């Protein structure tokens with residue numbers, strides 16, 4: 001039945017459609033901003049439309065999946081449906097460990113727009129679209145679309161890119177690069193900081209600290225060598241924030257956990273909140289893990 005690879009190949013095309021929606025909303029000018037729990041907790045027309053497109057498109061082709069999306073939404077336009085699939089991905093053999101997966105056992109975690117606050121600020125390259133695929137509680141495949149990749153290159157440039165990966169195959173669509181030798185460059189939240197977040201970072205002996213939006217964007221920073229660790233000692237992000245990004249990072253030898261070192265779980269019944277934060281690195285994960293203060297750990301219950 002070739003379920004996993006069929007799913008990944010469709011999710012790739014579905015994520016590309018999502019990128020067209022993200023760009024279309026900016027181009028038409030009205031972001032339809034709704035405030036949820038605070039002025040830094042926003043929902044736009046892009047979040048709502050992309051979620052409708054992704055969920056309807058996946059459910060049309062793979063009705064047995066469990067699909068969980070960030071937005072709590074109440075008839076979808078056929079114009080939002082994506083029926084395509086990547087023929088190239090479909091040509092790749094499924095890793096043998098996943099070859100007998102049944103569709104009803106997959107759980108898909110969707111963040112239709114990740115970095116929404118930064119989207120509304122015009123920090124457009126912070127934005128990603130995240131489609132994460134989990135089996136037996138583990139994140140095993142992921143798609144990350146970055147709709148404004150290349151947007152500063154001029155009117156003749158192609159906009160956007162799609163990064164995808166499967167554990168046992170690899171991760172693709174970017175150039176893997178380690179961060180500069182001899183430096184600790186720690187990346188973290190721009191808009192959702194607090195004292196605990198900054199105290200945990202201080203304990204790492206950073207040479208530089210980057211404050212940017214997006215969980216997907218920060219994993220891209222890790223795999224492209226713009227940062228050496230992603231440290232977020234706080235509640236606030238959810239399973240859809242970490243599912244697809246941890247796959248991409250794990251596929252190239254990195255590691256993402258909570259602040260204690262616990263792996264995150266992705267079964268259908270798990271709580272959405274990542275209540276003990278996020279710690280991630282491409283290389284030297286054990287260094288950063290070793291520097292988390294005990295006081296930070298006692299404050300953050302998984």
Ligand SMILES: Nc1ncnc2c1ncn2[C@@H]1O[C@H](COP(=O)(O)O)[C@@H](O)[C@H]1O
Nearest residue numbers: 041115189190191192213214215236237
């Ligand atoms: N305190 C929070 N309230 C709502 N969303 C949050 C919070 N903290 C983190 N997030 C979300 O988690 C993801 C990563 O956070 P950030 O690094 O701030 O962009 C984004 O989708 C944020 O909107």
Ligand SMILES: [Mg+2]
Nearest residue numbers: 041042070116
């Ligand atoms: Mg949100």
Ligand SMILES: [Mg+2]
Nearest residue numbers: 111112113114
């Ligand atoms: Mg989102």
Ligand SMILES: [Mg+2]
Nearest residue numbers: 111114115241
């Ligand atoms: Mg998010």
